[PDB]
Amino acid sequence: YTMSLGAENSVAYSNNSIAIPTNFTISVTTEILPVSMTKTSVDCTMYICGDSTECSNLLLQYGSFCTQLNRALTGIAVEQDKNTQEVFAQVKQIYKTPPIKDFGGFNFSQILPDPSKPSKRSFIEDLLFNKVTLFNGLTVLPPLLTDEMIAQYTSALLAGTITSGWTFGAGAALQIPFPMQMAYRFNGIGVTQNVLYENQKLIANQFNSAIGKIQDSLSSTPSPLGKLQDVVNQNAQALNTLVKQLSSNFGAISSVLNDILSRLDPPEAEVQIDRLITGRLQSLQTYVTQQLIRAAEIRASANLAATKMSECVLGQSKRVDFCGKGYHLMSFPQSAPHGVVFLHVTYVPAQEKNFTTAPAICHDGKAHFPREGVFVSNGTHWFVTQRNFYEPQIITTDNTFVSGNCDVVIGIVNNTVYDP
Amino acid sequence: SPLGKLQDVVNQNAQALNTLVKQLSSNFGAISSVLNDILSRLDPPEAEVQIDRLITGRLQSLQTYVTQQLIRAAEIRASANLAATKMSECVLGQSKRVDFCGKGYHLMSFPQSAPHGVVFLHVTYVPAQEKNFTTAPAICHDGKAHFPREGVFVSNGTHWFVTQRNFYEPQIITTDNTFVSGNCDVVIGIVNNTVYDP
Amino acid sequence: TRAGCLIGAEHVNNSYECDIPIGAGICASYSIIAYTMSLGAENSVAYSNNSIAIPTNFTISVTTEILPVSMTKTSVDCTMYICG
Amino acid sequence: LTGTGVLTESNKKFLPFQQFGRDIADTTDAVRDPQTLEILDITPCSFGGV
Ligand SMILES: *[C@@H]1O[C@H](CO)[C@@H](O)[C@H](O)[C@H]1NC(C)=O
Ligand SMILES: *[C@@H]1O[C@H](CO)[C@@H](O)[C@H](O)[C@H]1NC(C)=O
Ligand SMILES: *[C@@H]1O[C@H](CO)[C@@H](O)[C@H](O)[C@H]1NC(C)=O
Ligand SMILES: *[C@@H]1O[C@H](CO)[C@@H](O)[C@H](O)[C@H]1NC(C)=O
Ligand SMILES: *[C@@H]1O[C@H](CO)[C@@H](O)[C@H](O)[C@H]1NC(C)=O
Ligand SMILES: *[C@@H]1O[C@H](CO)[C@@H](O)[C@H](O)[C@H]1NC(C)=O
Ligand SMILES: *[C@@H]1O[C@H](CO)[C@@H](O)[C@H](O)[C@H]1NC(C)=O
Ligand SMILES: *[C@@H]1O[C@H](CO)[C@@H](O)[C@H](O)[C@H]1NC(C)=O
Ligand SMILES: *[C@@H]1O[C@H](CO)[C@@H](O)[C@H](O)[C@H]1NC(C)=O
Ligand SMILES: *[C@@H]1O[C@H](CO)[C@@H](O)[C@H](O)[C@H]1NC(C)=O
Ligand SMILES: *[C@@H]1O[C@H](CO)[C@@H](O)[C@H](O)[C@H]1NC(C)=O
Ligand SMILES: *[C@@H]1O[C@H](CO)[C@@H](O)[C@H](O)[C@H]1NC(C)=O
Numbered sequence: 001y002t003m004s005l006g007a008e009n010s011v012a013y014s015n016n017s018i019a020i021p022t023n024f025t026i027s028v029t030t031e032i033l034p035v036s037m038t039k040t041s042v043d044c045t046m047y048i049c050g051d052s053t054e055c056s057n058l059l060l061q062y063g064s065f066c067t068q069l070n071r072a073l074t075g076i077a078v079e080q081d082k083n084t085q086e087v088f089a090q091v092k093q094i095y096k097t098p099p100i101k102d103f104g105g106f107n108f109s110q111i112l113p114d115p116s117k118p119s120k121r122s123f124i125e126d127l128l129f130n131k132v133t134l135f136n137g138l139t140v141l142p143p144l145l146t147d148e149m150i151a152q153y154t155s156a157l158l159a160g161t162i163t164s165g166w167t168f169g170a171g172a173a174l175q176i177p178f179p180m181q182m183a184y185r186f187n188g189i190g191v192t193q194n195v196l197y198e199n200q201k202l203i204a205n206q207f208n209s210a211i212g213k214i215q216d217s218l219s220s221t222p223s224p225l226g227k228l229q230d231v232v233n234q235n236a237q238a239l240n241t242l243v244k245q246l247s248s249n250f251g252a253i254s255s256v257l258n259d260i261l262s263r264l265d266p267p268e269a270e271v272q273i274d275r276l277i278t279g280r281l282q283s284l285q286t287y288v289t290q291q292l293i294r295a296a297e298i299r300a301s302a303n304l305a306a307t308k309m310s311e312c313v314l315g316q317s318k319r320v321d322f323c324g325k326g327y328h329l330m331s332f333p334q335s336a337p338h339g340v341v342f343l344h345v346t347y348v349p350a351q352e353k354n355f356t357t358a359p360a361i362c363h364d365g366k367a368h369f370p371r372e373g374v375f376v377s378n379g380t381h382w383f384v385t386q387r388n389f390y391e392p393q394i395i396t397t398d399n400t401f402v403s404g405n406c407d408v409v410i411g412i413v414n415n416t417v418y419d420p
Numbered sequence: 421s422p423l424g425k426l427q428d429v430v431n432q433n434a435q436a437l438n439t440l441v442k443q444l445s446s447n448f449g450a451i452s453s454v455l456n457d458i459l460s461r462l463d464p465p466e467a468e469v470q471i472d473r474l475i476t477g478r479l480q481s482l483q484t485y486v487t488q489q490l491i492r493a494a495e496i497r498a499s500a501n502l503a504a505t506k507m508s509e510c511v512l513g514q515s516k517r518v519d520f521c522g523k524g525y526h527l528m529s530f531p532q533s534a535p536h537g538v539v540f541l542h543v544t545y546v547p548a549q550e551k552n553f554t555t556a557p558a559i560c561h562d563g564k565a566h567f568p569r570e571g572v573f574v575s576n577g578t579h580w581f582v583t584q585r586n587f588y589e590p591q592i593i594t595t596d597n598t599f600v601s602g603n604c605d606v607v608i609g610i611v612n613n614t615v616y617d618p
Numbered sequence: 619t620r621a622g623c624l625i626g627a628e629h630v631n632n633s634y635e636c637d638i639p640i641g642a643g644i645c646a647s648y649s650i651i652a653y654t655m656s657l658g659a660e661n662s663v664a665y666s667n668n669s670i671a672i673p674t675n676f677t678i679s680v681t682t683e684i685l686p687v688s689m690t691k692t693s694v695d696c697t698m699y700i701c702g
Numbered sequence: 703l704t705g706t707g708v709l710t711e712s713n714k715k716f717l718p719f720q721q722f723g724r725d726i727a728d729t730t731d732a733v734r735d736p737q738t739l740e741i742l743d744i745t746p747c748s749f750g751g752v
Contacts, residue, residue, distance in 0.1 A: 041751070051706075063446045063481060064439055071435075072488070081639070090519070096662040104608070135729060135746060142621050146643045152657060163663045170524050171546045174671040175663045179557060179608070180572070184585075193567055194601035197557055200608060243727040258704055274449050278476075285484060292491050300498065307520075315518030422682070429686050437692065444699070455702060478700045489692075496689050503685040522681040536690070540683040547673030555670045574670065588674040609667065622750065 016411070018357040020376060021349030022390040024195075026203055028210035029324040030217070030224070031342040033305040034231050036084045037298050038338070039077035039141040040239065040291070044069050046137035047246065048280045052257055055273055065281055069288045076295045081144045083302035087340060088145070088153040090309060095160040095173060103178040105204035108162065110211055111332055111343070113155050121151050124334045124341070127218045132225055132337045134232065136246060138239065150335045157313055157333055169314025182329075188316045189327040189347055190388050207345065214343065228339050234294065242287045250279030305340050309333055312342065327388075349388060358382070361395060362406030363417040371399050382415045394418055426537045432492065440485045448477030503538050507531060510540065525586075547586060556580070559593060560604030561615040569597050580613045592616050619644045619652075627652040705730060705744065712743035 012019075044066035049055035059066075097112060113120050121129065129147070145153075164173040165181045179200060183193035196203060218224060249255040252272035253264070260272050312323040312331035323331055324344030332343040356377030360367045373384045376392065383392035384399055393399065396418045406412045447453040450470035451462070458470050510521040510529040521529055522542030532539040553574035558565040571584050573593070581590035582597055591597065594616045604610045621641030628649065633656035636645035646652045703722060712732050716723065722733040732743050 043751075046749075058449060061447050062449055063443050063477065065481070065484075068439060068484065068488075091658070093659045093661055094657050096660075098662065098665045102667060139750060142642045144639050144641055144643075144645075149643060149655075149657060156657070160663075163665045166518065167547075169518050172548075172550065173663050174547075174550060174673070175665045175669055177555065177557075177609075177667055177670070180555070180670075183557075187570075192601075197567070197607050198601070240727055243729070247728060277449075282480070285480075289487055292488070296491060296494060299495075303498075310519040311517050318516065423684055425684050425686050429689055433690055433692070440694075475700060479696075482694070482696060482699065485694075492689065496686055499686045500688065503687055506683075506685070522679070522683070524679055527678070534684065534687075536688055537684060537686045540685070542681045542683060544679050544681065546677040546679050547675075548677045549675035550671045550673045552664075553670050553672060554668050556668065572670065572672070574672065583672065586673065587676070588672045 012354070016356050016358070016377075018355050018374065018376065019352045020355055020374070020385065020390045021352045021388065023349075023351035024199075024389070025348045025350050026206040026210060026329070027324070027326055027346050027348050028207070028214055029344040029346065030214055031308075031324070031344060032225055032227050032336065032339060033308070033342070034227050034298055034301045034339045035087045035305055035336075036080040036143065036302065036338055037231055037294065038235055039080050039143065040235070041073045041077060041139055041141055042069070042242075042284065042287075043137035043139075044281075044284060047284060048277060050136065050257060052261075054261075054270075055257060055277070058270065058274060059277055062277060062281075065285070069284060072288050072292060076291060077141055079295060079299060083299055084143060084145050084150070087302055087306045087309060088150055088157075090306075090314065091153070091156050091160060091168065093160075093168075093173070094152065094156040095163065095168065096156075097159040097163065103162065104182075104200060105208075106178060106182075107204075107208045107211065108158075110215055111158060111334065113151070119148055119151065120155070121147075122334070123215060124218065124343070125151055125154070125336075127215070128225065128334065128336050128341060131218065131222075132228055132232075134337075136243070138242070147335065147337075154333050154335050154340075157309075161313060161330065161332070166315040169310070185316055185329050186347075188318070189329065190386070191347070192386060192389075192391070195389055195391070210345075211343075225336070228336055231294075231298070231338060238287055238290060238294075242283065245283040246280065248279065250276050252276055308342060309340070312344070353390065358411055358413040360403075360406065360409045360412045361400070361415045361417060362409075362412045363415060365405055366402045367404055367406040367409050367412060368395070368397075368400040368402055368417050371401055373399065377413075382413070396420060423534070426534055429492075429496070429536060436485055436488060436492075440481065443481040444478065446477065448474050450474055506540060507538070510542065551588060556611045557609045558601075558604065558607045559598070559613045559615060560607075560610045561613060563603055564600045565602055565604040565607050565610060566593070566595075566598040566600055566615050569599060571597065580611070594618060624652050626650060629653065703730070703733065707744045707746045709742045709744060712741045714741060714743070716741050 045056060045059065049059055101108070110123050113122055118126055160168040160173055162178060163175055165176050165184065167174040179196065182203070183196045186196050187193060247255055252260065252275050254260050257273060257276070260269050264272065308323060311317045312328065313333050317323050317328050323342070324346040326346030326348040328344065329347050330345040332345070334341040334343065358375050358377065360369050361375060361382065370384050373386050375395070376383050376385050378392070382395060384395050385392045395415065398420065400417060445453055450458065450473050452458050455471060455474070458467050462470065506521060509515045510526065511531050514528070515521050515526050521540070522544040524544035524546040527543045527545050529543065530541040532541065553576070556573050558567050559573060559580065568582050571582050574581055574583055574590065576590070580593055582593050583590045593613065596618060598615060619640065619642055621644065627646050628651060630651045630653045633654055634647065635658070636653065636655040637647045639645045640652070643654050644652055645655050714732060716734055723731050725731045730744055732741055734741050
């Protein structure tokens with residue numbers, strides 16, 4: 001069939017009408033980003049020849065391709081180490097959460113490290129690590145940073161986040177009450193602190209429920225870490241195809257050098273060896289070039305991950321959809337086998353209600369405009385409220401400003417402005 | 421070692437050129453690496469065969485150099501796009517993005533030229549000389565809760581004040597810099613204090 | 619070590635901001651000593667429900683950032699290079 | 703079948719008619735010694751970078 005783009009609805013647009021949400025949902029979204037790939041170095045001489053002096057003798061006359069490929073792979077490995085260090089090593093101090101976990105009812109025991117000592121990893125890190133499942137001149141160099149240190153870096157970042165907010169990313173960590181941090185973040189997205197201080201229990205419950213839902217999705221739903229799995233699969237496929245290409249004759253009598261030497265006279269035997277050299281060297285160069293392209297793509301992904309961590313973990317981002325669907329509140333990093341996982345805490349309006357609206361209020365022959373808010377209309381009376389939450393207030397000179405008479409504004413209504 | 425990136429780029433380009441020139445001096449399995457000797461010593465059929473093998477080797481090496489140059493060009497273009505974004509967002513304006521233009525709250529930026537690059541001097545604001553204080557979410561006065569407009573309530577042990585978050589400038593709590601949002605029986609942590617009315 | 623073995627460097631129990639990275643968390647510095655790298659200063663913030671830290675002073679810091687913009691423009695005559 | 707490496711005792715069990723074994727990517731891993739009909743594990747001796 002022809003695919004359907006989605007639900008087909010028309011917004012109830014009207015000249016005098018507005019829709020304002022009266023309640024909210026705290027959503028937590030998971031984002032997976034590859035950071036680094038396995039560091040592989042291939043001995044060009046051994047792969048092409050396989051410890052045969054005569055093959056080496058003709059190979060050396062054939063160029064300096066071995067040096068080029070070796071330096072390319074070494075640069076790729078160093079770049080992988082740089083990517084990992086850049087993404088995670090953002091803080092200069094390893095912060096710690098206090099033993100007393102009183103965060104206003106917000107629960108973080110699923111993302112904080114646990115005393116059980118499973119490599120100092122939380123469920124989400126443990127779930128991700130469990131979820132992802134993984135000799136003729138090629139070798140794999142271990143990463144500079146072990147999983148334990150990456151987990152420690154993540155724990156330091158998360159502890160600094162909850163205990164200090166965004167201050168530790170812009171200087172020295174400054175302790176803050178968690179409720180105050182959440183209120184500051186609400187102020188950032190344009191909602192007054194009163195909403196949090198009056199709905200703190202609901203917000204904490206919603207956040208805990210969202211974290212539990214993320215844990216359930218990771219535990220049960222599969223195919224959530226496709227990007228890391230795809231990267232690992234591509235690397236494995238490249239290595240396997242390279243090893244298989246080693247077992248191809250490339251148009252000679254045999255694919256193994258020992259047999260060719262043991263059965264053939266030196267001139268045509270060396271000719272066959274040379275054709276094998278050409279085929280194997282070309283295949284190795286193809287592998288190196290594809291590895292370089294993959295390294296560039298992974299570096300782009302790692303730069304994106306570092307930007308996300310700096311702009312969403314160390315601070316609050318006003319960029320739309322950069323760190324989750326909805327008004328971004330906070331973000332939490334988590335380690336992954338070759339990547340990072342971001343839990344984006346966002347604010348989503350819900351339970352909207354229609355309200356009539358006027359650009360300004362004409363009182364005493366002068367026009368009044370809201371300072372920061374909207375003149376919604378109840379059937380009984382006109383009210384001024386904030387855009388992102390329905391908190392009606394009596395129109396007053398305190399929250400309105402005058403900008404002349406009321407004969408120039410299109411759509412102005414007549415109402416009284418209370419003077420206190 | 422402060423300009424390692426530019427030095428590294430120059431070194432990589434020089435290394436690629438040098439290895440290309442050296443590869444020109446390889447026989448690629450032929451009798452000689454120089455065409456003149458092959459032509460002057462050999463009959464046309466095998467001489468042309470040797471020439472063809474040199475052609476294959478040299479052309480393949482040139483293609484390898486071109487491919488690596490293309491990859492380096494893509495990486496340099498990514499870096500240049502980042503530099504242009506930094507210039508537009510930090511030199512032509514003030515950026516709220518954290519750590520995008522320096523450690524600390526970004527103030528202003530200055531560009532400077534470099535032999536094959538640009539140098540940004542990021543002027544940033546870094547808080548220092550911190551002090552501890554006792555805070556409260558709101559103030560309960562006259563049976564109603566007062567919240568700061570833009571700031572925080574702190575107490576110098578015995579007297580509550582309202583100041584800005586990023587600098588310690590205590591001020592007397594007043595209805596001018598606070599707003600009321602109902603009674604004081606729902607806020608967790610609220611205290612009792614007087615709100616001065618001017 | 620997990621990266622192989624070291625000859626000529628002696629292992630120490632202390633941890634420092636290491637200089638020469640070796641692998642698997644082990645790295646060496648200057649006799650040549652090998653150790654597990656230290657991530658940094660290890661401190662705990664004095665978190666309380668009613669405690670804040672507010673700065674009373676500021677520092678204007680200037681930081682230098684280097685960014686490559688372009689590389690040398692090289693054109694190679696393919697025919698002349700290959701044949702001469 | 704020619705090769706180079708270190709031989710060691712193996713606990714894997716081969717079928718009677720079956721002489722040697724290959725891992726993924728078609729690389730030899732174990733061989734049965736003809737004289738004693740015994741299974742030997744084959745691993746290449748240590749190589750690497752300095
Ligand atoms: C807002 O929506 C949430 C959804 O979980 C609900 O629990 C809460 O009671 C709602 N609040 C109001 C005031 O309706
Ligand atoms: C967080 O959830 C865990 C679930 O086992 C519970 O044991 C713990 O007490 C919770 N913490 C808070 C502060 O609710
Ligand atoms: C506003 O009214 C229209 C028309 O009845 C309706 O379709 C729409 O859902 C209403 N919106 C809200 C938020 O009540
Ligand atoms: C409109 O506002 C008045 C005054 O705040 C309130 O009593 C009433 O319930 C609201 N709704 C309607 C439908 O009048
Ligand atoms: C709003 O639009 C309607 C649509 O017909 C029009 O009748 C009405 O006069 C407009 N009201 C204004 C501009 O206040
Ligand atoms: C508002 O009041 C003025 C003065 O009485 C009048 O001219 C104007 O028509 C009124 N507008 C409305 C919408 O009632
Ligand atoms: C606290 O602030 C008050 C001003 O309200 C001042 O008089 C007093 O000396 C300060 N210090 C202490 C220890 O109360
Ligand atoms: C910290 O907890 C105590 C009771 O344990 C409470 O009285 C106080 O108000 C809390 N701090 C804040 C800022 O709410
Ligand atoms: C503030 O003072 C009133 C006086 O009646 C008292 O009832 C209320 O409990 C006080 N608030 C706090 C947080 O102690
Ligand atoms: C703030 O710190 C700077 C450091 O250079 C110092 O010169 C200045 O006197 C300090 N100001 C205060 C008020 O302590
Ligand atoms: C033979 O099959 C059984 C049953 O699956 C298994 O337990 C045993 O390990 C197998 N032998 C070998 C050598 O794999
Ligand atoms: C020769 O092979 C037989 C198997 O048929 C074995 O029993 C015997 O021990 C072998 N003799 C040797 C290895 O000397």
